[PDB]
Structure formats: structure tokens, C-alpha cells
Design an enzyme around this catalytic site. Structure first.
Site, PDB file in Angstrom:
ATOM      1  N   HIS A   1       0.705  -0.951  -0.071  1.00 54.60           N
ATOM      2  CA  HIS A   1       0.235  -0.087  -0.015  1.00 54.60           C
ATOM      3  C   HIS A   1       1.076   1.018  -0.455  1.00 54.60           C
ATOM      4  CE1 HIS A   1       0.420   0.013   4.725  1.00 54.60           C
ATOM      5  NE2 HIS A   1       0.432   1.164   4.475  1.00 54.60           N
TER       6      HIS A   1
ATOM      7  N   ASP B   1      -0.044  -7.274   0.430  1.00 53.47           N
ATOM      8  CA  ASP B   1       0.592  -6.250   1.396  1.00 53.47           C
ATOM      9  C   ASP B   1       2.043  -6.622   1.539  1.00 53.47           C
ATOM     10  OD1 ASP B   1       0.936  -3.163   2.115  1.00 53.47           O
ATOM     11  OD2 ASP B   1      -0.281  -3.575   3.548  1.00 53.47           O
TER      12      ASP B   1
ATOM     13  N   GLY C   1       2.749   5.502   9.082  1.00 55.28           N
ATOM     14  CA  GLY C   1       4.491   5.599   8.975  1.00 55.28           C
ATOM     15  C   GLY C   1       4.885   4.723   9.165  1.00 55.28           C
TER      16      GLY C   1
ATOM     17  N   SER D   1       4.403   1.307   8.482  1.00 59.17           N
ATOM     18  CA  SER D   1       3.842   0.750   7.746  1.00 59.17           C
ATOM     19  C   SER D   1       5.051   0.643   6.380  1.00 59.17           C
ATOM     20  CB  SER D   1       2.466   1.304   6.299  1.00 59.17           C
ATOM     21  OG  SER D   1       1.688   1.460   7.444  1.00 59.17           O
TER      22      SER D   1
ATOM     23  N   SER E   1       1.707  -4.335   8.005  1.00 57.58           N
ATOM     24  CA  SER E   1       0.780  -3.765   7.382  1.00 57.58           C
ATOM     25  C   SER E   1      -0.611  -2.541   7.670  1.00 57.58           C
ATOM     26  CB  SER E   1      -0.621  -4.832   6.847  1.00 57.58           C
ATOM     27  OG  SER E   1      -1.370  -4.773   6.031  1.00 57.58           O
TER      28      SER E   1
HETATM   29  N1  LIG Z   1      -1.075   1.906   8.021  1.00 56.90           N
HETATM   30  C1  LIG Z   1      -0.159   2.603   8.509  1.00 56.90           C
HETATM   31  C2  LIG Z   1       0.589   1.415   9.747  1.00 56.90           C
HETATM   32  C3  LIG Z   1      -0.273   1.440  10.517  1.00 56.90           C
HETATM   33  C4  LIG Z   1      -0.133   0.366  12.000  1.00 56.90           C
HETATM   34  C5  LIG Z   1      -0.827   0.513  12.254  1.00 56.90           C
HETATM   35  C6  LIG Z   1      -1.967   1.712  13.466  1.00 56.90           C
HETATM   36  O1  LIG Z   1      -2.807   1.317  13.977  1.00 56.90           O
HETATM   37  C7  LIG Z   1      -1.881   2.371  12.322  1.00 56.90           C
HETATM   38  C8  LIG Z   1      -1.033   2.963  11.396  1.00 56.90           C
HETATM   39  C9  LIG Z   1       0.663   3.093   7.274  1.00 56.90           C
HETATM   40  O2  LIG Z   1       0.222   3.405   5.968  1.00 56.90           O
HETATM   41  O3  LIG Z   1       1.933   4.470   8.026  1.00 56.90           O
END
Ligand SMILES: N[C@@H](Cc1ccc(O)cc1)C(=O)O
Ligand SMILES: [Cl-]
Ligand SMILES: [Cl-]
Ligand SMILES: [Cl-]
Ligand SMILES: [Cl-]
Length: 185
Positions: free
Chosen positions: A33, A63, A139, A141, A156
Site C-alpha cells: 500500500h 501487502d 508512518g 507501515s 500492514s
Molecule cells: N497504516 C499505517 C500503519 C499503521 C499501523 C497500525 C496502526 O494502528 C495505524 C497505522 C501506514 O500506512 O503508515
């Protein structure tokens, strides 16, 4: 640069997962993503230190994604911060695991389920995920999940945060390594 460090696309910040290679051609893995719609990646928010170019993305369903390095001088450490990485392995229920990311740093917990499905909405359903009680925030991720010298997963998504606690899902890294024919080092 190493696993867990910030990486910047044209639109935002994620985290490097693991440095990988095929022969002397170096890449890094991150979340799919994050690679979806991205081209160039940089090491800094000012977008002056180029890392490389997106070279694959699998999201949703999976992912994971991959970035080909174009910067020949930057160090590409086969580590997650100070943790030496030497191989990949699969998660098991109850396994102690650690995540590193560029928003929240290093946090540890346990695997609570395997083969989890996560519906992010908008058709973005991912399957086969490692569920944990490790926290994460936006961030983080793409950053690594590891245990000792073993690469295990790529961050993910999930719920909660590192202040109050959360639940985070990880893409098994072995799937990405096999899909691209690359290896951790
Ligand atoms: N979705 C976030 C990662 C994430 C992980 C856990 C969470 O509670 C929230 C965010 C990423 O694109 O940067
Ligand atoms: Cl940022
Ligand atoms: Cl090789
Ligand atoms: Cl090199
Ligand atoms: Cl180990």
C-alpha cells in the site's frame, strides 16, 4: 539505511522493511500500500537524497512491494537498526516478535493469530496476515517484524497506537521474498 528507517515517496512517509538482494542488485521491501502509485523514494523529508524507484507492488490481497536502489553510495545495511538480520522465517502463534518503524521506533509483543484477513475498506481486503498485539502508528507501515536474526513480516495496518496500545497485522516476508526471488542479507 536499515530496516525501520523513514522512506519518502512523492506523497508521504513510510518505513523501510528489509534490505534484500538478488546477486549484487540491491533492493528494499516495504508495504504494497506504500508502493502503490509511488515512483521515486527518498531518504529525507526534503527529498534530496534519492534511494531508488518502485519496482513492484502487491496490494490489496497481499501487502508487499519492492524498491530498486539507484543510489550507489548510501549504506544498505542488512539489519533492523542494531539487530543483525541473516535469514527469514515464518511466524507461529505465541512467538515473541519485534517491530521497528519510523514513527514509533522499536516495540515488541507476540503473535496472536496466523492467516488473518483485514478489510481496510474500499475493496482493500488483505489475506494471510500475521496478527499481533504489537502497536503501530501511521508512518510505521512497511517496517520490519523480526525475531532475533530472522526477518518475519512487513507492517500492514491495524488499530490503536503506541501510547494506549494496539493490534497490528503484518504481511509474511517469506511470501515477498519468494514472489520476487530475492533474499535478505
Ligand atoms: N497504516 C499505517 C500503519 C499503521 C499501523 C497500525 C496502526 O494502528 C495505524 C497505522 C501506514 O500506512 O503508515
Ligand atoms: Cl513525515
Ligand atoms: Cl543471491
Ligand atoms: Cl552495496
Ligand atoms: Cl536468531
Amino acid at each position: 539505511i536499515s530496516g525501520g528507517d523513514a522512506i519518502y515517496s512523492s506523497t508521504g512517509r513510510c518505513s523501510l522493511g528489509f534490505n534484500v538482494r538478488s546477486g549484487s542488485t540491491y533492493y528494499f521491501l516495504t508495504a504494497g500500500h506504500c508502493t502503490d502509485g509511488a515512483t521515486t523514494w527518498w531518504a529525507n523529508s526534503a527529498r534530496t537524497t534519492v534511494l531508488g524507484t518502485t519496482s513492484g507492488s502487491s496490494f490489496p490481497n497481499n501487502d508487499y512491494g519492492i524498491v530498486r536502489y539507484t543510489n550507489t553510495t548510501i549504506p544498505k545495511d542488512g539489519t533492523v537498526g542494531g539487530q543483525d538480520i541473516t535469514s527469514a522465517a515464518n511466524a507461529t502463534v505465541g512467538m515473541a516478535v519485534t517491530r521497528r518503524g519510523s514513527t514509533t521506533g522499536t516495540h515488541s509483543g507476540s503473535v496472536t493469530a496466523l492467516n488473518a484477513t483485514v478489510n481496510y475498506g474500499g475493496g482493500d481486503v488483505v489475506y494471510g496476515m500475521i496478527r499481533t498485539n504489537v502497536c503501530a502508528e501511521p508512518g510505521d507501515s512497511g517496517g520490519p517484524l523480526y525475531s532475533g536474526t530472522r526477518a518475519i513480516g512487513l507492517t500492514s495496518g491495524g488499530s490503536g497506537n503506541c501510547s494506549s496500545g494496539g493490534t497490528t497485522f503484518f504481511q509474511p516476508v517469506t511470501e515477498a521474498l519468494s514472489a520476487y526471488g530475492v533474499s535478505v542479507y
